[PDB]
Structure 1
Amino acid sequence: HHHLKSINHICFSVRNLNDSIHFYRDILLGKLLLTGKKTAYFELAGLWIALNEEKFSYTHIAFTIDDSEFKYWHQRLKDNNVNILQSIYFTDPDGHKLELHTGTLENRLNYYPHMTFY
């Protein structure tokens, strides 16, 4: 009893809202829901993302894709000049670190001997 229920949304600061809208809505195929003065809201991978215009290495957000889609995503990111760093590692136009994976994190947990599993 008493648990946080779910993720509610993520918020990212961005230098240029138009560049970020083409990245999230066209290259990553998220749904644009609303725009305002210096803001945009998307639904992407079931997650509300809020971008805030204000004209780094200590966090990343990873997303799951169908493994049969891996070549489609790698080619899509490559052919849209995305900064690329089975798994794909990349950034958005501001440098926020993102990743695509074709397996759950739990399935990696099953992969890993001197670690301690709970």
Structure 2
Amino acid sequence: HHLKSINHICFSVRNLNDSIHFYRDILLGKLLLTGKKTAYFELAGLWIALNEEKDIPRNEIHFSYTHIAFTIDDSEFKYWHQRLKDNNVNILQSIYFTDPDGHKLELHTGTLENRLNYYKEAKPHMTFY
């Protein structure tokens, strides 16, 4: 009875047109649908839905407790770093960054297996299953 796969992710965003430029132009996703308050993309093989909420407060911290990471090839690290820098993206191996609203994103060059093997050497008092 297991869950089969990730199906989609939805993000609330304050300005649809800023978020379409981010996900479509900067991150090279495919725009598939728009409405007044909605946009769907396919990005990295994943359906991403954006829901526009123009009243999310800009003077408060939100989006603190989740991050989403996408895979890139190690050889593409400098290309992506430079692409995000040249697009004035908020940047915090991995590249940590935010979308225009503050949703926390990451580009990462390794696998879960790579990370487990790293921790078995670096953090050997963790418990491995």
Verify same fold: TM over 0.5: yes
Unmatched segments (≥5 aa) in structure 1:
none
Work out the percentage of aligned pairs sharing the same amino acid.
100
Displacement of 1:36 in angstroms is 0.8
Displacement of 1:110 in angstroms is 1.1
What TM-score do you get using the length of structure 1 for normalisation?
0.97
Q: Return the alpha-carbon distance in structure 1 between the equivalents of residues 11 and 109 of structure 2.
A: 24
SS in 2 for 1:4: coil
SS in 2 for 1:73: helix
What TM-score do you get using the length of structure 2 for normalisation?
0.89
Question: Deviation above 4 Å: which 4+ runs of structure 1?
Answer: none
Q: Deviations over 1:53-96 (max 9, x none)?
A: 00011000001101110000000000000000011000000000
SS in 2 for 1:24: helix
Q: Deviations over 1:28-58 (max 9, x none)?
A: 0000000012000000011000000000110
Unmatched segments (≥5 aa) in structure 2:
55-62
Q: Return the alpha-carbon distance in structure 2 between the equivalents of residues 74 and 105 of structure 1.
A: 22
Question: Which residue of structure 1 aligns with residue 90 of structure 2?
Answer: 83
Q: Deviations over 1:91-110 (max 9, x none)?
A: 00000000001111221111
Tell me the matched-pair count.
Answer: 117
Counterpart pick for 1:69 among 47, 68, 76: 76
Pairwise CA RMSD: 0.6
Q: Return the alpha-carbon distance in structure 2 between the equivalents of residues 37 and 70 of structure 1.
A: 35
